[PDB]
Protein backbone atom coordinates (compact mmCIF):
# COMPACT_ATOMS: atom_id res chain seq x y z
CA UNK A 1 0.00 0.00 0.00
CA UNK A 2 1.01 3.66 -0.25
CA UNK A 3 0.01 7.09 1.00
CA UNK A 4 0.20 10.30 -1.00
CA UNK A 5 3.74 11.21 0.07
CA UNK A 6 5.15 7.73 -0.47
CA UNK A 7 3.22 7.52 -3.74
CA UNK A 8 4.87 10.69 -5.06
CA UNK A 9 8.27 9.54 -3.77
CA UNK A 10 7.89 6.18 -5.52
CA UNK A 11 6.60 7.87 -8.69
CA UNK A 12 9.77 9.96 -8.80
CA UNK A 13 12.12 7.14 -7.76
CA UNK A 14 10.90 5.08 -10.71
CA UNK A 15 12.08 7.92 -12.98
CA UNK A 16 15.26 8.56 -10.99
CA UNK A 17 14.34 12.20 -10.42
CA UNK A 18 14.88 14.58 -7.53
CA UNK A 19 11.92 16.16 -5.77
CA UNK A 20 11.05 19.24 -7.84
CA UNK A 21 8.45 21.98 -7.57
CA UNK A 22 5.48 19.94 -8.78
CA UNK A 23 6.20 17.03 -6.44
CA UNK A 24 6.69 19.36 -3.49
CA UNK A 25 3.42 21.06 -4.47
CA UNK A 26 1.63 17.71 -4.25
CA UNK A 27 3.25 17.07 -0.88
CA UNK A 28 2.25 20.50 0.44
CA UNK A 29 -1.27 19.91 -0.89
CA UNK A 30 -1.51 16.79 1.25
CA UNK A 31 0.07 18.62 4.20
CA UNK A 32 -2.47 21.46 4.17
CA UNK A 33 -5.50 19.15 4.53
CA UNK A 34 -4.04 17.38 7.56
CA UNK A 35 -6.39 18.63 10.26
CA UNK A 36 -9.71 17.60 8.71
CA UNK A 37 -8.54 14.03 8.17
CA UNK A 38 -7.45 13.30 11.75
CA UNK A 39 -10.54 14.99 13.16
CA UNK A 40 -12.82 13.01 10.83
CA UNK A 41 -10.99 9.80 11.76
CA UNK A 42 -11.32 10.53 15.49
CA UNK A 43 -15.05 11.25 15.23
CA UNK A 44 -15.52 8.13 13.09
CA UNK A 45 -13.66 5.98 15.61
CA UNK A 46 -15.77 7.46 18.41
CA UNK A 47 -19.02 6.89 16.48
CA UNK A 48 -18.19 3.60 14.69
CA UNK A 49 -20.80 1.33 16.27
CA UNK A 50 -23.49 4.02 16.08
CA UNK A 51 -22.65 4.55 12.42
CA UNK A 52 -23.04 0.82 11.75
CA UNK A 53 -26.35 0.86 13.62
CA UNK A 54 -27.87 3.67 11.56
CA UNK A 55 -26.40 2.30 8.32
CA UNK A 56 -27.96 -1.10 8.98
CA UNK A 57 -31.32 0.39 9.99
CA UNK A 58 -31.31 2.71 6.96
CA UNK A 59 -30.11 0.34 4.23
CA UNK A 60 -30.52 -3.33 5.20
CA UNK A 61 -32.85 -4.03 8.11
CA UNK A 62 -36.68 -4.24 8.16
CA UNK A 63 -36.63 -5.99 4.79
CA UNK A 64 -36.69 -9.43 3.21
CA UNK A 65 -32.95 -9.80 3.84
CA UNK A 66 -33.47 -10.11 7.61
CA UNK A 67 -36.44 -12.47 7.14
CA UNK A 68 -36.04 -16.23 6.61
CA UNK A 69 -34.56 -17.30 3.30
CA UNK A 70 -32.46 -14.14 3.05
CA UNK A 71 -28.70 -13.88 3.30
CA UNK A 72 -28.89 -11.82 6.45
CA UNK A 73 -31.21 -14.36 8.06
CA UNK A 74 -29.97 -15.97 11.32
CA UNK A 75 -27.77 -14.37 13.97
CA UNK A 76 -24.67 -15.96 12.42
CA UNK A 77 -25.17 -14.24 9.07
CA UNK A 78 -26.24 -10.98 10.73
CA UNK A 79 -23.04 -10.93 12.79
CA UNK A 80 -21.08 -11.67 9.62
CA UNK A 81 -22.70 -8.74 7.80
CA UNK A 82 -22.20 -6.29 10.66
CA UNK A 83 -18.56 -7.37 11.06
CA UNK A 84 -18.10 -6.76 7.34
CA UNK A 85 -19.63 -3.29 7.71
CA UNK A 86 -17.29 -2.47 10.60
CA UNK A 87 -14.37 -3.76 8.52
CA UNK A 88 -15.37 -1.58 5.57
CA UNK A 89 -15.73 1.51 7.75
CA UNK A 90 -12.34 0.89 9.39
CA UNK A 91 -10.53 0.49 6.08
CA UNK A 92 -12.32 3.54 4.67
CA UNK A 93 -10.96 5.44 7.67
CA UNK A 94 -7.49 4.09 6.87
CA UNK A 95 -7.77 5.15 3.22
CA UNK A 96 -9.05 8.59 4.19
CA UNK A 97 -6.12 9.13 6.56
CA UNK A 98 -3.59 7.84 4.03
CA UNK A 99 -5.05 9.85 1.14
CA UNK A 100 -4.85 6.86 -1.19
CA UNK A 101 -7.03 3.92 -2.32
CA UNK A 102 -4.10 1.48 -2.51
CA UNK A 103 -4.86 -0.04 0.90
CA UNK A 104 -8.50 -0.59 -0.10
CA UNK A 105 -7.42 -2.15 -3.40
CA UNK A 106 -5.00 -4.46 -1.62
CA UNK A 107 -6.57 -5.62 1.65
CA UNK A 108 -10.30 -5.24 0.93
CA UNK A 109 -11.41 -5.45 -2.69
CA UNK A 110 -9.08 -8.34 -3.58
CA UNK A 111 -11.26 -11.39 -4.27
CA UNK A 112 -14.26 -10.00 -2.37
CA UNK A 113 -16.47 -9.83 -5.47
CA UNK A 114 -15.87 -13.46 -6.43
CA UNK A 115 -16.14 -14.67 -2.82
CA UNK A 116 -19.44 -12.85 -2.30
CA UNK A 117 -20.65 -14.25 -5.62
CA UNK A 118 -19.77 -17.74 -4.37
CA UNK A 119 -21.45 -17.19 -0.99
CA UNK A 120 -24.62 -15.53 -2.28
CA UNK A 121 -24.03 -12.12 -0.69
CA UNK A 122 -26.16 -9.27 -2.09
CA UNK A 123 -23.80 -6.85 -3.82
CA UNK A 124 -26.54 -4.24 -4.23
CA UNK A 125 -27.37 -4.47 -0.52
CA UNK A 126 -23.66 -4.16 0.30
CA UNK A 127 -23.39 -1.03 -1.85
CA UNK A 128 -26.50 0.41 -0.21
CA UNK A 129 -25.06 -0.17 3.25
CA UNK A 130 -21.77 1.42 2.18
CA UNK A 131 -23.61 4.48 0.92
CA UNK A 132 -25.65 4.65 4.14
CA UNK A 133 -22.50 4.66 6.27
CA UNK A 134 -21.09 7.25 3.86
CA UNK A 135 -24.11 9.45 4.54
CA UNK A 136 -23.84 9.01 8.31
CA UNK A 137 -20.11 9.79 8.33
CA UNK A 138 -20.71 12.82 6.13
CA UNK A 139 -23.24 14.03 8.66
CA UNK A 140 -21.02 13.30 11.65
CA UNK A 141 -17.69 14.68 10.43
CA UNK A 142 -19.02 18.10 9.48
CA UNK A 143 -17.98 20.26 6.55
CA UNK A 144 -14.21 19.89 7.11
CA UNK A 145 -13.68 16.30 5.93
CA UNK A 146 -17.06 14.99 4.69
CA UNK A 147 -16.02 15.11 1.04
CA UNK A 148 -12.68 13.35 1.58
CA UNK A 149 -14.39 10.72 3.72
CA UNK A 150 -17.04 10.24 1.03
CA UNK A 151 -14.56 9.72 -1.82
CA UNK A 152 -13.13 6.44 -0.50
CA UNK A 153 -16.57 5.07 0.40
CA UNK A 154 -17.47 5.80 -3.22
CA UNK A 155 -14.27 4.00 -4.22
CA UNK A 156 -15.27 0.88 -2.27
CA UNK A 157 -18.79 0.97 -3.71
CA UNK A 158 -17.48 1.40 -7.26
CA UNK A 159 -14.91 -1.37 -6.86
CA UNK A 160 -17.53 -3.79 -5.57
CA UNK A 161 -20.01 -2.75 -8.27
Amino acid sequence: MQDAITAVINNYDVQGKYLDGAALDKLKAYFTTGAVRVRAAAVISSNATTIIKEAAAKALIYSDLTRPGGNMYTTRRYAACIRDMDYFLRYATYAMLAGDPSILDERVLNGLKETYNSLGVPIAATVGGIQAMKEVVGGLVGPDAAKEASIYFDYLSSGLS
Binding site: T6, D13, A41
Partner: protein
Protein backbone atom coordinates in the same frame (compact mmCIF):
# COMPACT_ATOMS: atom_id res chain seq x y z
CA UNK B 1 6.51 7.91 5.44
CA UNK B 2 4.96 8.74 8.80
CA UNK B 3 1.57 7.80 7.32
CA UNK B 4 2.62 4.24 6.46
CA UNK B 5 4.29 3.64 9.82
CA UNK B 6 1.28 5.07 11.69
CA UNK B 7 -1.22 3.06 9.60
CA UNK B 8 0.55 -0.32 9.49
CA UNK B 9 0.46 -0.79 13.27
CA UNK B 10 -3.21 0.25 13.37
CA UNK B 11 -4.00 -2.31 10.66
CA UNK B 12 -1.92 -4.86 12.56
CA UNK B 13 -3.80 -4.59 15.84
CA UNK B 14 -7.12 -3.85 14.01
CA UNK B 15 -8.30 -0.52 15.39
CA UNK B 16 -8.81 3.08 14.40
CA UNK B 17 -5.96 5.51 14.95
CA UNK B 18 -4.97 6.42 18.51
CA UNK B 19 -4.68 10.08 19.60
CA UNK B 20 -0.90 9.92 20.02
CA UNK B 21 -0.68 8.71 16.43
CA UNK B 22 -3.02 11.49 15.30
CA UNK B 23 -1.04 14.21 17.06
CA UNK B 24 2.29 12.92 15.77
CA UNK B 25 0.65 13.21 12.36
CA UNK B 26 -0.16 16.82 13.34
CA UNK B 27 3.48 17.56 14.13
CA UNK B 28 4.48 15.95 10.83
CA UNK B 29 1.92 17.90 8.78
CA UNK B 30 2.71 21.16 10.58
CA UNK B 31 6.40 20.71 9.74
CA UNK B 32 5.55 20.18 6.05
CA UNK B 33 6.54 23.54 4.59
CA UNK B 34 9.81 23.59 6.52
CA UNK B 35 10.49 20.03 5.35
CA UNK B 36 9.96 21.10 1.73
CA UNK B 37 12.26 24.10 2.15
CA UNK B 38 14.89 21.84 3.73
CA UNK B 39 14.71 19.36 0.85
CA UNK B 40 14.89 22.11 -1.78
CA UNK B 41 18.34 23.37 -0.73
CA UNK B 42 19.83 19.87 -0.87
CA UNK B 43 18.54 19.55 -4.44
CA UNK B 44 20.01 22.96 -5.28
CA UNK B 45 23.37 21.75 -3.95
CA UNK B 46 23.12 18.24 -5.43
CA UNK B 47 26.17 18.07 -7.72
CA UNK B 48 28.21 20.31 -5.41
CA UNK B 49 27.71 18.29 -2.21
CA UNK B 50 28.90 15.06 -3.84
CA UNK B 51 32.14 16.66 -5.11
CA UNK B 52 33.01 17.84 -1.62
CA UNK B 53 32.03 14.48 -0.08
CA UNK B 54 34.16 12.50 -2.52
CA UNK B 55 37.27 14.52 -1.69
CA UNK B 56 36.89 13.94 2.05
CA UNK B 57 36.19 10.23 1.50
CA UNK B 58 39.28 9.77 -0.66
CA UNK B 59 41.43 11.83 1.71
CA UNK B 60 40.26 9.73 4.65
CA UNK B 61 41.02 6.51 2.80
CA UNK B 62 42.81 6.76 -0.57
CA UNK B 63 43.21 2.99 -0.87
CA UNK B 64 39.90 2.64 -2.72
CA UNK B 65 41.34 4.81 -5.51
CA UNK B 66 44.52 2.73 -5.41
CA UNK B 67 45.37 0.11 -8.07
CA UNK B 68 44.16 -2.65 -5.77
CA UNK B 69 41.11 -0.62 -4.80
CA UNK B 70 37.50 -1.12 -5.85
CA UNK B 71 37.21 2.45 -7.16
CA UNK B 72 40.39 2.46 -9.27
CA UNK B 73 39.80 4.16 -12.61
CA UNK B 74 37.84 7.10 -13.95
CA UNK B 75 34.65 5.13 -14.58
CA UNK B 76 34.92 3.26 -11.27
CA UNK B 77 35.22 6.57 -9.40
CA UNK B 78 32.30 7.96 -11.41
CA UNK B 79 30.19 4.97 -10.36
CA UNK B 80 31.00 5.56 -6.69
CA UNK B 81 30.12 9.23 -7.03
CA UNK B 82 26.85 8.16 -8.67
CA UNK B 83 26.09 5.89 -5.71
CA UNK B 84 26.74 8.79 -3.33
CA UNK B 85 24.36 10.92 -5.41
CA UNK B 86 21.81 8.09 -5.17
CA UNK B 87 22.04 8.11 -1.39
CA UNK B 88 21.78 11.90 -1.30
CA UNK B 89 18.57 11.62 -3.33
CA UNK B 90 17.28 8.95 -0.95
CA UNK B 91 18.08 11.20 2.01
CA UNK B 92 16.05 13.97 0.37
CA UNK B 93 13.21 11.46 -0.07
CA UNK B 94 13.35 10.58 3.62
CA UNK B 95 13.51 14.25 4.62
CA UNK B 96 10.41 15.13 2.63
CA UNK B 97 8.46 11.98 3.57
CA UNK B 98 9.17 12.35 7.29
CA UNK B 99 10.25 8.74 7.84
CA UNK B 100 12.56 6.13 6.33
CA UNK B 101 10.16 3.91 4.37
CA UNK B 102 11.35 5.01 0.89
CA UNK B 103 15.01 5.01 1.98
CA UNK B 104 14.70 1.50 3.40
CA UNK B 105 12.75 0.00 0.51
CA UNK B 106 15.01 1.58 -2.11
CA UNK B 107 18.56 1.44 -0.82
CA UNK B 108 19.26 -0.43 2.44
CA UNK B 109 17.39 -3.75 2.30
CA UNK B 110 19.80 -6.15 0.63
CA UNK B 111 22.52 -3.50 0.34
CA UNK B 112 24.85 -5.82 2.25
CA UNK B 113 24.40 -8.52 -0.39
CA UNK B 114 24.78 -5.74 -2.99
CA UNK B 115 28.16 -4.59 -1.78
CA UNK B 116 29.34 -8.09 -0.90
CA UNK B 117 28.70 -9.32 -4.44
CA UNK B 118 30.42 -6.20 -5.76
CA UNK B 119 33.14 -6.63 -3.09
CA UNK B 120 32.88 -2.95 -2.17
CA UNK B 121 33.98 -1.75 1.30
CA UNK B 122 30.80 -1.05 3.25
CA UNK B 123 32.75 0.81 5.99
CA UNK B 124 34.23 2.96 3.22
CA UNK B 125 30.69 3.64 1.98
CA UNK B 126 29.78 4.70 5.52
CA UNK B 127 32.52 7.35 5.61
CA UNK B 128 31.44 8.43 2.13
CA UNK B 129 27.92 9.00 3.44
CA UNK B 130 29.21 10.84 6.52
CA UNK B 131 31.15 13.22 4.28
CA UNK B 132 27.87 14.07 2.56
CA UNK B 133 26.36 14.67 6.00
CA UNK B 134 29.10 17.14 6.90
CA UNK B 135 28.92 19.01 3.59
CA UNK B 136 25.13 19.18 3.83
CA UNK B 137 25.28 20.44 7.42
CA UNK B 138 27.73 23.15 6.32
CA UNK B 139 25.06 24.68 4.04
CA UNK B 140 22.00 24.63 6.32
CA UNK B 141 20.75 26.48 9.38
CA UNK B 142 21.23 24.77 12.73
CA UNK B 143 17.77 23.31 13.24
CA UNK B 144 17.49 22.24 9.60
CA UNK B 145 21.07 20.96 9.71
CA UNK B 146 20.24 18.76 12.70
CA UNK B 147 17.04 17.61 10.98
CA UNK B 148 18.93 16.46 7.88
CA UNK B 149 21.66 15.04 10.11
CA UNK B 150 19.12 12.70 11.68
CA UNK B 151 18.43 11.04 8.31
CA UNK B 152 22.11 11.03 7.35
CA UNK B 153 22.81 9.39 10.71
CA UNK B 154 20.16 6.74 10.05
CA UNK B 155 21.65 5.98 6.63
CA UNK B 156 25.13 5.68 8.14
CA UNK B 157 23.83 3.35 10.83
CA UNK B 158 21.90 1.14 8.42
CA UNK B 159 24.73 1.00 5.87
CA UNK B 160 27.18 -0.89 8.08
Amino acid sequence: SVLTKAIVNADAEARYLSPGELDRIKSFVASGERRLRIAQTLTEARERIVKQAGDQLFQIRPDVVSPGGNAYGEKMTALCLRDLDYYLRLVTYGIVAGDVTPIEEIGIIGVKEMYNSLQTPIPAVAEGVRAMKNVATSLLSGDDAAEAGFYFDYLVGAMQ
